mmCIF file of C-alpha atoms in Angstrom:
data_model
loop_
_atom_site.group_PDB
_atom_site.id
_atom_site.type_symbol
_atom_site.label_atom_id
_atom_site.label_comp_id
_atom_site.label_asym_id
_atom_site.label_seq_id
_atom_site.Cartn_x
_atom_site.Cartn_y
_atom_site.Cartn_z
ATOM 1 C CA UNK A 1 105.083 112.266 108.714
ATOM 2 C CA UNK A 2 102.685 114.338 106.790
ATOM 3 C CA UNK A 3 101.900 111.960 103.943
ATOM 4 C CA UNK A 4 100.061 109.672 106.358
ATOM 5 C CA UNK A 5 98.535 112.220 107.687
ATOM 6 C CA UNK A 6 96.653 112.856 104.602
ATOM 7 C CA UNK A 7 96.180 109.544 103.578
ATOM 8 C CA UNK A 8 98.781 109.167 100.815
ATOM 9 C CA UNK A 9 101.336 106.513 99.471
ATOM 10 C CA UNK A 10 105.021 106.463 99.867
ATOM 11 C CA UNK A 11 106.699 105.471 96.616
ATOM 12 C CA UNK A 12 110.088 105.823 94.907
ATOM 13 C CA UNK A 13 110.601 108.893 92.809
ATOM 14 C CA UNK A 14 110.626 106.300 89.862
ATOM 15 C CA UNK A 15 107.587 104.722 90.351
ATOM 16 C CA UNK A 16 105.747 107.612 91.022
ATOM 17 C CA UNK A 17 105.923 109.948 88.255
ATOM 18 C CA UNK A 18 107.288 113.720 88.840
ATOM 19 C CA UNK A 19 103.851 114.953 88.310
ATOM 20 C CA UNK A 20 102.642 112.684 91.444
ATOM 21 C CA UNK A 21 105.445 113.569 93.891
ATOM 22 C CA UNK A 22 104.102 115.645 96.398
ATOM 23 C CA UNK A 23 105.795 117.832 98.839
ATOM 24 C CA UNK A 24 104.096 115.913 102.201
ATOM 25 C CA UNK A 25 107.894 115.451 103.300
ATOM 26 C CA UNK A 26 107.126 112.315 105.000
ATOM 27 C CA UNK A 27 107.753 109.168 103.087
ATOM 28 C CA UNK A 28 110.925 106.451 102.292
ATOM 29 C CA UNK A 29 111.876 108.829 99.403
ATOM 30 C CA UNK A 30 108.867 110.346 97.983
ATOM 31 C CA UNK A 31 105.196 110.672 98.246
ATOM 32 C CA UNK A 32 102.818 109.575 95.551
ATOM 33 C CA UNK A 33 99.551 111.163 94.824
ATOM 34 C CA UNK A 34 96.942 108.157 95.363
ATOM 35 C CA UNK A 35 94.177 110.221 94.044
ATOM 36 C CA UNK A 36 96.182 110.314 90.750
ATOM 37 C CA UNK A 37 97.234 107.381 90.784
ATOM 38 C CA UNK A 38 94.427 105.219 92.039
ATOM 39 C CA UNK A 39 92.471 105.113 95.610
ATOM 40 C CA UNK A 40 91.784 101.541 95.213
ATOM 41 C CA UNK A 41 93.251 101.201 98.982
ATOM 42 C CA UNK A 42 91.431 104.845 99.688
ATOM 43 C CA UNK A 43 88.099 103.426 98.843
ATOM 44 C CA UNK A 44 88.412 100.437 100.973
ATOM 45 C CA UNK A 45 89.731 98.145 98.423
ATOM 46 C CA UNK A 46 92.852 95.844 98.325
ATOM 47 C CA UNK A 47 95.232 93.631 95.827
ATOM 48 C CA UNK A 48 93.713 90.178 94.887
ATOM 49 C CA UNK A 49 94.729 87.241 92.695
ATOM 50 C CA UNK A 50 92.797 86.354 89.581
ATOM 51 C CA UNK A 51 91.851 82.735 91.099
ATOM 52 C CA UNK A 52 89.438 85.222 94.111
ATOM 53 C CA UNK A 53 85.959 85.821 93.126
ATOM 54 C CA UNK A 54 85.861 89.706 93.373
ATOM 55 C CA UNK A 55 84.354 93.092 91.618
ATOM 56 C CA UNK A 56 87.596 94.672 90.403
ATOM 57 C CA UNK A 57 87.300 97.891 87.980
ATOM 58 C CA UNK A 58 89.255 98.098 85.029
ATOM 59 C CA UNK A 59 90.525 101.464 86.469
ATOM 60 C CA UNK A 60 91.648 99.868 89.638
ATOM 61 C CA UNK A 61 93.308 96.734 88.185
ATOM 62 C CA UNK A 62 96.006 98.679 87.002
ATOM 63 C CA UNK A 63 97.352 99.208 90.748
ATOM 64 C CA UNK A 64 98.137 95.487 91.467
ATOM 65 C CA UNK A 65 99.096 95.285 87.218
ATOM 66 C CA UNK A 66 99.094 92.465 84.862
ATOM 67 C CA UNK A 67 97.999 88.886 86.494
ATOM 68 C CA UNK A 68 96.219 90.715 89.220
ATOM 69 C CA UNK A 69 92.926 92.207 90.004
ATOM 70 C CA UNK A 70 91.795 94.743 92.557
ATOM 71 C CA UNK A 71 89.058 93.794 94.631
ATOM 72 C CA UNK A 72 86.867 96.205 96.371
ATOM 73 C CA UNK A 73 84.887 94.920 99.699
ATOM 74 C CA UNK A 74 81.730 97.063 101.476
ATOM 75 C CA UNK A 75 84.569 98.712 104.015
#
């Protein structure tokens, strides 16, 4: 697996647009561009609910979508 190896994110070819889809050959179907996309996992930062006390960005809330908010801890 090369997508790993890089430090990307598997995702299927319709979630990830055609402009994302790399050529890492190493994922369930294809690999996603998190740098793209959004690093929110890249930058040490992981998929909270809205009822956690966090500092999500407006650019990272997107990831986890509507009803959820990115937090981002010193890691």
């Amino acid at each position: 697996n090369e997508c790993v190896s890089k430090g990307f994110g598997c995702l299927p070819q319709s979630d990830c647009p055609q402009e994302a889809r790399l050529s890492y050959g190493g994922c369930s179907t294809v690999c996603c561009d998190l740098s793209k996309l959004t690093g929110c996992k890249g930058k040490g930062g992981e998929c909270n609910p809205l009822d956690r006390q966090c500092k999500e960005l407006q650019a990272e809330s997107a990831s986890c979508g509507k009803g959820q908010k990115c937090c981002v801890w010193l890691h």
